[PDB]
Symmetry: D2
């Protein structure tokens, strides 16, 4: 009876707008091409469209675009369909509604806070998903970990980080099955665009991101584990971590060393992960390596071959390890949350 959900039953097309056509924005565009009932009808980015079209067609790590891309006067012709490309620097000036846009992926990195991201509503968009944390009045959502926190009335939400989308389902499964006292994370992580190609002054003052990223093992700080409480309240304040950036251009792996609230065996841990598996959190027993997860659609892929339970006179330390393509795994999660959020809008 009619306080009912509707968009799940009778929505034809979810029209998406992308503000910021960097790595994530372009990869989200690519994924949406394969999502029935969701399509991008507007891109906004200050870069010359000739440059943007070229980078959409050709991608070092993710391969050639599946289809044709041609620059036109007001935007691109992508697999026939024209798609407007604007270059407004003020989000309040983007007339999203003229292109039917209802939800915006905000991926520039300059409008993270609620009031900043809500500028897209002035142009007529209804909802916004941020490609980063994750402020004071904004929920953080890892799809298939805590998207049930959404009621559909929120205006701005965060898709969390890529590392959070890998860690969260793995840490939650430990908590649900065994209980976590505390734990430390180490991500062995592909280099990224916040590192220098060769040694040189880094804008932020980071003496390690100043170093050649493709020729070094580079320690760097993280926030996923310290901030996990935003996705899994029961783990608030229980985890910390850091990263080692290494010379691959994409593909990463997350290790968690944890003290649990009860004793376990390796098989029990692995069986718990298998039972928690879904389209966001995969399970494998194959001895794969990082190139095997590039382009994959899981947000997180648990690797049962790397599980360890160290038992010393009954005192136990546990290691669990999950793979992720820090590019496409995070993008696949963003797109799941984009669609879900739009469809439970009401």
């Amino acid at each position: 009876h009619h306080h009912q959900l509707e968009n799940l039953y009778f929505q034809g097309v979810v029209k998406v707008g992308i503000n910021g056509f960097g790595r994530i924005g372009r990869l989200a565009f690519r994924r949406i091409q394969n999502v029935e009932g969701v399509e991008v009808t507007r891109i906004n980015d200050l870069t010359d469209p000739v440059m943007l079209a070229h980078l959409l067609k050709y991608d070092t790590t993710q391969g050639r675009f599946d289809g044709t891309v041609e620059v036109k006067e007001g935007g691109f012709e992508v697999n026939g369909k024209f798609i407007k490309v604007s270059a407004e620097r003020d989000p309040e000036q983007i007339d999203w509604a003229t292109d039917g846009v209802e939800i915006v992926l905000e991926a520039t990195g300059f409008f993270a806070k609620k009031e900043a991201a809500e500028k897209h509503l002035k142009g007529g968009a209804k909802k916004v998903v941020i490609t980063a944390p994750g402020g004071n009045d904004v929920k953080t959502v890892v799809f298939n970990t805590n998207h049930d926190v959404l009621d559909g009335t929120e205006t701005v939400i965060s898709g969390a980080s890529c590392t959070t989308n890998c860690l969260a389902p793995m840490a939650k499964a430990l908590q649900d099955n065994f209980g976590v006292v505390e734990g430390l994370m180490t991500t062995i992580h592909a280099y990224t665009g916040d590192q220098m190609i060769l040694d040189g002054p880094h804008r932020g003052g980071d003496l390690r991101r100043a170093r050649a990223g493709a020729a070094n093992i580079v320690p760097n700080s993280t926030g996923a584990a310290k901030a996990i409480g935003l996705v899994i309240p029961e783990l608030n304040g229980k985890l910390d971590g850091s990263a080692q950036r290494v010379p691959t251009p994409t593909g990463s792996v997350t290790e968690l060393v944890a003290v649990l609230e009860k004793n376990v065996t390796v098989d029990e841990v692995n069986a718990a992960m298998k039972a928690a598996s879904n389209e966001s959190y995969g399970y494998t027993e194959d001895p794969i390596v990082s190139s095997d997860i590039v382009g994959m659609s899981y947000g997180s892929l648990f690797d049962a071959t790397q599980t360890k339970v160290l038992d010393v006179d009954g005192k136990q330390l546990v290691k669990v390890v999950s793979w992720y393509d820090n590019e496409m795994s995070y993008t696949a999660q963003l797109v799941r949350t984009l669609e879900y959020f739009a469809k439970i809008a009401k």
Copy 2:
């Protein structure tokens, strides 16, 4: 003068030769390897990661002339075939990827050598020595000893310091490690059957099993059975870093942890507070370099997990430790 012979002129054998050139009272007078000496001379002169050789190398009838001195190069395959005594060799560096067994390594004594140091674990009936961690275990009467592995030479002083200052309940190690010659350059069948070492080593993050932490008890009895670990091989050709996450027997602060490491520092175990990266340690002579910038103490309602991290050049750091043990071992004679 300690006259040393080298069996196996691979990465470690060649780098040990380079180091011994600078150890007064130690000199190599006999190399032997089943490779054409022209190939060996070229690989001694030119080294992708460790640079060009300091001096002159010329191939001559029976071996090399290195900085004037001639050095016999043989090509046997049984240590008994090596007349170490004809070249005056007293102690042998055994550095082929095989032969890591006492009876197997004792074959060199028939050729007239007195002592043998094997460049890998092989310690069922053989003492395992990380210099400046436990070389005091040697009395000089041993025939064959092990220099342990390079991961052990990195971990051991760090783990020993935690044990000495605070007590260790248990711990898990992760080493982010340069690729090595037991991995394939491109995807292909690995002779051991390892499905991960069969993969392209310079284009992947590759999980790898280790033994350093599980076998630490051979170097630090007080840690026997308390540790486990594993590795992630990554696309650098040398330079590695070892992380240890441990449960200790008392609560600590970060400053207390770092101060304990500094107090344990010496020529084998370095200390830095500079935010370095892996290229900054390639070629260094410390066996282990503790990095105070990476220390973590997670305290959750008084229960603590501690992370400590040391760097090492898995090539030159290990080699420098081997040569320390070679010199000391020869010095304390029998």
Copy 3:
């Protein structure tokens, strides 16, 4: 009237056998999965099948296998179909005919010469294609450059090398349109399995292949240009060349600097290449880079953006440049020749 060709008209299935399941053998298997009317019914390789199945499923440069692979008693289950995998070290002992094999891809590198490769005929196979040169009584075939040299009665043929399959259509187009006096080739080439991962003794005695291949620019000798006469008789003895191996795991590019028999312009050269283009020899005017050709199906991809015509008081030197994936481009050519050879057998 009935001295007619038949296999082009009424052949149902070309059954292929692969001797040697290395990089090329596995990639040829992958391509054949997408070739209607051609299928592999027998693999012979001395490697443990568990290792071989794993390497077919997971491929660092060419991605995950499109489908499922499962080890069975006598071989593999690949996308349902069972495929026998033997491990005979003597090719005369391979009973190809029991599996209906008519043509063998001989890719071990130990049976290049005619008499050696003809051992496969003892087991009942009819034809053999060698994945390397290219002996004294054996024709060398670059598909869509000189496959018309085949009359279908040959027993053993060579698919040439991967570098030859890139150079040949480019050199032939210059010869046909303008005439070649002489020329020198330089390939900038991915590292390969004949190089060491770290500095160490090389079995062949090559002091450069002994060096770490992923951490160096490594000069190495070639044979494609010196031996081009085997594919293009009119260029016999007119070319020489060499290679620089560089730190990418696949993807290569071939430059030819040539003296021609007449003066030209850059546009004239590029137009000549466009007219010579086909499914083996592509044409592009996009400023691509090496990652953009990994996995591609052209044997050779001419890049019009790199064309140069240096004219000094009327004396001209010309540079033309073509891309190739030294893995998949060569494999795609091998598979074209495999099918054609089987189908004009008669």
Copy 4:
């Protein structure tokens, strides 16, 4: 003592500082760069490709203390803002990726410097000097000069030797070149609009335009307009090799070509017959290293095409040439 000031403490500026430490009678007394001195001190100490600094570096109020001596570090952005004379600087190394113009570079003279050397082409009204190829063109009265590019410093002695011995009709260059800081670490918009420098530089073979061969006439008048070329950038962080394919004015043999290069050899132009690879030249002080193992003479019915190949460390080889020109330029004063 020649007192030098450095504007721009990037790769070249820092490596030139490292070299000048070993040039007696030349010393840097003033650096200025718009970067925080803490960042600059860290990058001087630690260098991914060129190793750790030889000495001590400590940040202090007005700059660095390097091996005791204090060195002022400023952060202006207009050469007139630099009081070179207050620091006694006579000659300025102008090494920011901009300012490659005579009037632009002459701004340093207002601050009290006498001469300027720009670390890139900028030669419309500025002489271009490859040391030991054409530094005899300087008379000492010039204010601003160019050290040319690093590709020019590699090509020039090789091309000059062909011209001197045999005569050059024409030629095309290909350099297989390390990636540089004008390429992206990952695919992304390039500020110049270059669709190839927008691509991940350590994961691709990247075609690149050059100017060294087209502009060679500025260093070797006899080759003006005779050459063209281009580059392939590849995944090494330093170390490069330049190939020249040329039509000569007479027929030659390989031995004749190689002998001519050996006779042209000097401190700027080296000669080797060893089959080296790129890591063997990183850090070398020669501007150019001719490799006789790569020489080709293709003779087809008497018509010849010749290939000659030289190595260079696009970082340190170029820097060593710059510092040679700095010293000479200061020495021949006005």
